[PDB]
Design a protein around this ligand. Structure first.
Ligand SMILES: NC(=O)C1=CN([C@@H]2O[C@H](COP(=O)(O)OP(=O)(O)OC[C@H]3O[C@@H](n4cnc5c(N)ncnc54)[C@H](OP(=O)(O)O)[C@@H]3O)[C@@H](O)[C@H]2O)C=CC1
Ligand SMILES: O=C(O)CCC(=O)C(=O)O
Length: 417
């Protein structure tokens, strides 16, 4: 139940309800512009040939070449890929990139595939979808169960097929630094989230120096968010959690020590000098910034009234339900929309694509400054729409993104109204 695509269409329809958009443009936006389903045959280590199902959905390319990652998950469906491409369209539109929306995926369990089999899978996927991808057509990226090594393999296969007739480095992002990689990719999402948190604090008029932050989820995104907050913003990290449990310390925590203790003991549980807590009561501490960077849909009707965070930074992909959205807005809580808070990753991916296209590569400082400018401008545009239209922050972000895409469509002459 609860079809993925249908939910995206519903959301797109809730967004259009707050803005003036023609019916033909909305109907165009409700349909992906191109969907490609291909068979991906690879040779297994036992010599047998197995055929996998691969997807490549390009939702819209009015603003430019489509952008989106490739997922290798056993539960991947065409509907999920279409919904994620639709969401990626708004994600690149809100942060003002010359990109469209795209997405790819292969129905495969990568846990049971060896390195050689994974390389064969990546190369065969490239051989299957070469005709619909390119540096100026469709730029894939890392995603769940996919890493930069697979990006390098895919880029090498694309370069082999294209015969080095153009910027083969720019066809795919997230590559290793040795081959067309970009500095600052590892901490892109956390850096963008930190920039949006700083801008939100500036908007609310509060100083983050010496304040408290709780991060729910301690993956790369959560750990880097906590570390960057403590370093740059000067905030005090109070509570973190893994999939198992959480810890509490009112005097503060050192993210590096927590990470060191997490990989050593396999979990964040039972950290010395800290009190063991659960995610459900961790979301309820009185803090100024709360950053859910974990399992989706963790804030609902049950716990919406108990949130005491002044700012909620949705690092994860939609951890707050729309009814919880309304409840939090009624309480005077500033929410950064999920596809705006974690837009730093796609922005750094765009920077990598620009570097590959141009043949000139930037330093860490230049990438950080450009990311700062882009994220600050996007957040301030969203907040200004919020204030002007008297709508929710998520609604304002949807309004901005759909307005940009609609203007791009009207300029091309695709829609006459
Ligand atoms: N990675 C990125 O570049 C960006 C990520 N996002 C979204 O953000 C989130 C984090 O990013 P990512 O680095 O990929 O995640 P990771 O795979 O690196 O880490 C996953 C983490 O969340 C924890 N977790 C899983 N389920 C729960 C749960 N039910 N309760 C509490 N903690 C849980 C895991 O715990 P444990 O350590 O015990 O396994 C782990 O700490 C994801 O949801 C992702 O989709 C979007 C923006 C870009
Ligand atoms: O870099 C990209 O194009 C996709 C990265 C991503 O998964 C994201 O930013 O949500």
């Amino acid at each position: 139940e609860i079809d993925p695509f249908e939910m995206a269409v519903k959301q797109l329809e809730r967004a259009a309800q707050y803005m003036d958009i023609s019916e033909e443009a909305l109907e165009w936006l409700k349909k992906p512009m191109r969907i490609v389903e291909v068979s991906v045959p690879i040779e297994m280590d036992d010599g047998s040939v197995k055929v996998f199902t691969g997807f490549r959905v390009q939702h819209n390319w009015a603003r430019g070449p489509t952008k989106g990652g490739i997922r290798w998950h056993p539960a991947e469906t065409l509907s999920t890929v279409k919904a994620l491409a639709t969401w990626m369209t708004w994600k690149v539109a809100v942060v003002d990139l010359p990109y469209g929306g795209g997405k790819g995926g292969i129905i495969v369990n990568p846990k049971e595939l060896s390195e050689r089999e994974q390389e064969r899978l990546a190369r065969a996927y490239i051989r299957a979808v070469y005709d619909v991808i390119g540096p100026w057509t469709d730029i894939p990226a890392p995603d769940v169960y996919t890493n930069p090594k697979i990006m390098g393999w895919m880029m090498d296969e694309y370069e082999t097929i294209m015969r080095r007739k153009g910027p083969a480095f720019g066809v795919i992002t997230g590559k290793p630094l040795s081959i067309g990689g970009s500095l600052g990719r590892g901490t892109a999402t956390a850096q963008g989230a930190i920039f949006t948190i700083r801008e939100a604090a500036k908007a609310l008029g509060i100083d983050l120096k010496g304040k408290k932050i709780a991060v729910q989820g301690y993956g790369n995104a959560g750990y880097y968010t906590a570390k960057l907050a403590k370093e740059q913003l000067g905030m005090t990290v109070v509570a973190v959690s893994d999939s198992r449990g959480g810890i509490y310390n009112p005097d503060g925590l050192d993210p590096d020590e927590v990470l060191k203790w997490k990989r050593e003991h396999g979990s964040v549980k039972d950290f010395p000098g800290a009190t063991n807590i659960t995610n459900e009561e961790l979301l309820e501490l009185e803090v100024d910034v709360l950053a859910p960077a974990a399992i989706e849909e963790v804030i609902t009707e049950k716990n919406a009234d108990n949130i005491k965070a002044k700012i909620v930074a949705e690092v994860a992909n939609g951890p707050v339900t729309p009814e919880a959205d309304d409840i939090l807005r009624e309480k005077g809580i500033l929410q950064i929309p999920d596809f705006l808070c974690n837009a730093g990753g796609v922005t750094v991916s765009y920077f990598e694509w620009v570097q590959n296209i141009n043949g000139y590569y930037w330093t860490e400082e230049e990438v950080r400054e450009k990311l700062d400018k882009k994220m600050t401008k996007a957040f301030w545009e969203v907040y200004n729409t919020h204030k002007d239209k008297n709508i929710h922050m998520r609604d304002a972000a949807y309004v901005v993104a759909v307005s940009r895409v609609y203007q791009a469509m009207k300029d091309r002459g695709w829609v006459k109204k």
